[PDB]
Design a protein around this nucleic acid. Structure first.
Lengths: 48, 31, 10, 242, 159, 96, 120, 50, 45
RNA sequence: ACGAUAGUUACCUGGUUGAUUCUGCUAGUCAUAUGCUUGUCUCAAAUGACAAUAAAUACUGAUACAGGGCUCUUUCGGGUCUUGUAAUUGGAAUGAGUACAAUUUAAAUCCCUUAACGAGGAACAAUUGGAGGGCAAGUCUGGUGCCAGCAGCCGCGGUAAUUCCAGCUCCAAUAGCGUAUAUU
């Protein structure tokens, strides 16, 4: 695929598009974590 | 594990036990 | 503990 | 280079109409010319004397993104000989001439130019080749030629406009048969300069599915143009024709 | 991890740095500044601490010039990138200006003291060049390409 | 062993001095007597050449050995206070 | 006829600013023939055409190939100011600044081409 | 939190119908209104999974 | 979807899903680690 | 008003099993010991690799010649087009070092000025780990002949003799890194 340099993605730039999994969502709100705050936390990046 | 249970302590029915150390642990996180 | 391990090294 | 007068042969290409002229050190793309023996833009053309009248025309891929996509090897461009082909973006009609040569004397091309002088070139090529009718008006307002375009099967589109998805949405809604086939050209720098182009491509795709298409193939026409993506999809159904 | 390694290898290639040590230096500084950007987003709008810190920091960042002057928003300050940072790196400005034929060529010039920023010679190719200082990047007067003496090899074949 | 990361010991006898295969580990093994506990164990040297340098009754530093004879846990690292690997690269001489 | 004319409010000055930037960065082709060859080779990022030029058919025939290639072309009302903004000692009526893969001038081109894209 | 759209006439798809298609479906309908009470056909019309 | 576009960052918590996406290159992996989030294969962090 | 005058207007179908397909098959410690390596500049825990700061070991051509070079899902298969060479030459730039002086200073050193020298590799002499491939009139061990295994500086001669994979290949870190144990 385009912009794929040998198992490195050069196109992934903030605002990072992330995908949400079911079990991810489940255990996160189990862990009482504000999803978007914690996402901007780990990323230090603007997310959609 | 059930997702609805809060994590500050344990729950029996509608009763939530919170030990003195956990409320003092919240007393550490506020300061 | 680190002092104990250091002493054993000595 | 592929200098004039060399002896090359022509063989069929897997899409109907298009042939491939291979010879010596050069292999290149070509199409049967309807109006025999007359150039369009000083394009090169290939003669052949069959046991006279038959002559082909080469395309430059660097000139037409349609050509470039075919060289990249799209699956199918839906425009078989006989198929009514709407064009969008009749940029003086070069690729439009090529696509007219594809759809032949039984087909039809309806073209849209918005600029006037480009349109003069366009109607000139229409005056030569009878199977293309021009339409010079604003492609954003398909009310402007709803009296003039009947139901076509394949929409090519290559306008450089930022509202491109909603443009093709409305033109499709007014001019496409159930089981519509379309190709569209994406200049990521024209849609959104800042973003990474692959995501630009994705957003275009999702707007198109929002406008009720189904994408089925997509590629960067890379070694002929930078940051353009050809997208192949179907209107309103899954398999192509019907 | 192959993504990390291919990424850093690509970075040193497009900007011929010396090592992943230099790369991780640039990365750790990016981490500080994007972390400060994130905590500034953790403050809310029309909070005067957020207003003052944000305008001061974006002023700092367009003053060094790595931010484009068109955009002045903390979202884009958070969307900043190390490609822009190594574009800001001194030697890459030399190669972009065209005083050298290659990036390694320009790094050698900065090592053996041919180019100056404004007044003074700088030996280090990783100097932070500001937007105000990007103009005055030229050869030394002591450099043979600037003037003065013809040079060592010129002298030795002229002998 | 013990709590330490290294151990000093005394070369008893390079058992496996009658070996047929060069790089076999029973060639490369040597019984040592760790000093503080006075205990007999056996250890491996990484290379037969270094086995040629090592002789008896020399103080031996050794450590853990972690990655045809699995179970020998130690490997000799320094003899008479000198680095076996530096001898093996011929960097220093061995004090006798 | 020159309906993609640029307006006064600092738009024209931004054009001349990026023009001088491109003359320095050597990413600029100049004069009608070289602009023609650059857009023929498709390398041009954007093309700027004067409007005070003795009869305008030159900067009218250029937008034909600009309409072919679909490159942003824009009308500026002072060719002598183009000459000064390029640093020529001669008045220029046609200029074409091309694109490279690594520059912040490229971001300036992106902003400028978005502005003229909203313009026309 | 859904607004679901269901059909009535549990099988009777929408669409304009060709003449024999709707004659067939009206035929089956009134055919039921005769024979709905036989045990066999009654059970496989009342059989619905809950 | 990830195969088709290759622009996202997936956030899951199954290790088998993790193996699956780890099979393909160039995708980063988010999982909460009971204190916070935890990113696996993104280099810019 | 036409509509179940005793809602029995109920129940009369709760759902084994099996097959196939698609996935699945460690890193941090201001933590101690120790090893290896150290050309420049600042800096300093107790002169200094304990740290920390910046960065040399070179840059650019031409010409000649060869035709492979790589990749990888699916591999006696596919995918992509200019790549190389212990090739022949040409150019420049020089900082470590060498160093007249001047200056600094209680006297010196260092800093800042400074004339002159100071690159062709066999050198102005990069390191540390890991993995791999190639081998004999050699050795050792196993066996229903030639196979296999481990291995191999040791070979017939020969030390002023040899000129060998002629400097084999690849991964990592790089003026720092390895290993042990405790670990987390």
């Amino acid at each position: 695929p385009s912009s794929m340099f040998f198992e490195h993605n050069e196109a992934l730039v903030p605002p990072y598009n992330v995908l949400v999994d079911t079990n991810f969502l489940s255990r996160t709100v189990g862990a009482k974590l504000p999803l978007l705050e914690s996402a901007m936390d780990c990323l230090y990046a603007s997310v959609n | 594990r059930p997702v609805d249970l809060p994590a500050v302590g344990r729950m029996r029915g509608a009763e939530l036990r919170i030990s003195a150390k956990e409320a003092a642990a919240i007393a550490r996180e506020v300061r | 503990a680190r002092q104990a391990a250091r002493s054993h090294d000595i | 280079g592929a200098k004039a007068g060399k002896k090359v042969i022509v063989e069929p290409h897997r899409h109907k109409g298009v042939f491939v002229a291979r010879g010596g050190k050069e292999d290149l793309l070509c199409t049967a010319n309807l109006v025999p023996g007359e150039s369009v833009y000083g394009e090169k053309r290939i003669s052949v004397e069959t046991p006279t009248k038959t002559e082909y025309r080469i395309w430059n891929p660097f000139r037409s993104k349609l050509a470039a996509g075919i060289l990249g090897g799209l699956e199918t461009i839906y425009m078989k000989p006989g198929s009514k082909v709407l064009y969008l973006g009749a940029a003086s009609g070069t690729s439009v001439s090529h696509v007219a040569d594809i759809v032949g004397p039984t087909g039809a091309v309806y073209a849209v130019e918005f600029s006037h002088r480009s349109g003069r070139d366009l109607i000139n090529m229409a005056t030569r080749r009878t199977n293309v009718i021009p339409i010079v008006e604003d492609a954003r307002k398909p009310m402007a030629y709803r009296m003039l375009v009947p139901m076509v099967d394949v929409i090519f589109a290559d306008v450089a406009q930022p509202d491109q998805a909603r443009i093709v949405g409305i033109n499709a809604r007014l001019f496409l048969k159930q089981g519509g086939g379309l190709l569209i050209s994406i200049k990521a720098s024209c849609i959104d300069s800042t973003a990474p182009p692959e995501q630009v491509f994705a957003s275009e795709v999702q707007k198109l599915r929002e406008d009720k298409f189904f994408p089925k193939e997509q590629l960067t026409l890379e070694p002929y143009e930078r940051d353009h993506a050809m997208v192949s999809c179907v209107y309103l159904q899954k398999e192509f024709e019907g | 991890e192959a993504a990390r390694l291919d990424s850093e290898l690509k970075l040193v290639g497009e900007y011929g740095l010396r090592n992943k040590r230099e790369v991780w230096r640039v990365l750790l500084t990016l981490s500080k500044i994007r972390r400060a950007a994130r905590i500034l987003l953790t403050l809310d709008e029309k909070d005067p601490k957020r207003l003052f810190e944000g305008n001061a920091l974006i002023r700092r960042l367009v003053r060094i010039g790595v931010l484009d002057e068109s955009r002045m928003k903390l979202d884009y300050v958070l969307a900043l990138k190390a490609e822009d940072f190594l574009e800001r790196r001194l030697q890459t400005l030399v190669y972009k200006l065209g005083l050298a034929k290659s990036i390694h060529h320009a790094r050698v010039l900065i090592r053996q003291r041919h180019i100056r920023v404004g007044k003074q010679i700088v030996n280090v190719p990783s100097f932070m060049v500001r937007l105000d200082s990007q103009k005055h990047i030229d050869f030394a007067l002591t450099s043979p390409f600037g003037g003065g003496r013809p040079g060592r090899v010129r002298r030795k074949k002229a002998k | 062993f013990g709590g330490s990361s290294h151990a000093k010991g005394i070369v008893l006898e390079k058992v496996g001095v009658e070996a047929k295969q060069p790089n076999s580990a029973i060639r490369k093994c040597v019984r040592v007597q760790l000093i503080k506990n006075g205990k007999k164990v056996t250890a491996f040297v990484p290379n037969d050449g270094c086995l040629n340098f090592v002789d008896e009754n020399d103080e031996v530093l050794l450590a853990g050995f972690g990655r045809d004879i699995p179970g020998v846990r130690f490997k000799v690292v320094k003899v008479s206070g000198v680095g076996l690997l530096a001898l093996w690269k011929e960097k220093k001489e061995k004090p006798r | 006829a020159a309906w993609p004319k640029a307006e006064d409010p600092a738009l024209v000055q931004e054009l001349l600013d990026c023009v001088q930037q491109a003359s320095h960065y050597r990413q600029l082709k100049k004069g009608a023939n070289e602009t023609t060859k650059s857009v023929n080779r498709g390398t041009s990022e954007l093309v700027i055409l004067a409007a005070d030029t003795q009869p305008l058919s030159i900067v009218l025939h250029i937008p034909l190939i600009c309409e072919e290639k679909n490159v942003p072309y824009v009308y500026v009302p002072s060719k002598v100011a183009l000459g000064r903004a390029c640093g020529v000692s001669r008045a220029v009526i046609a200029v074409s600044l091309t694109s490279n893969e690594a520059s912040d001038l490229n971001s300036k081109i992106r902003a400028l081409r978005d502005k003229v894209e909203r313009l026309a | 939190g859904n607004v679901r759209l269901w059909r009535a006439n549990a099988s009777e798809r929408s669409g304009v119908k060709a003449t024999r298609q709707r004659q067939a479906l009206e035929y089956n309908n009134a055919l039921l209104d005769r024979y709905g009470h036989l045990p066999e056909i009654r059970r496989i019309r009342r059989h619905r999974h809950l | 979807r990830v195969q088709k576009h290759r622009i996202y960052i997936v956030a899951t918590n199954d290790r088998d899903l993790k193996r699956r996406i780890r099979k393909i290159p160039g995708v980063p992996i988010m999982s909460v680690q009971k204190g916070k989030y935890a990113i696996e294969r993104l280099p810019g962090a």
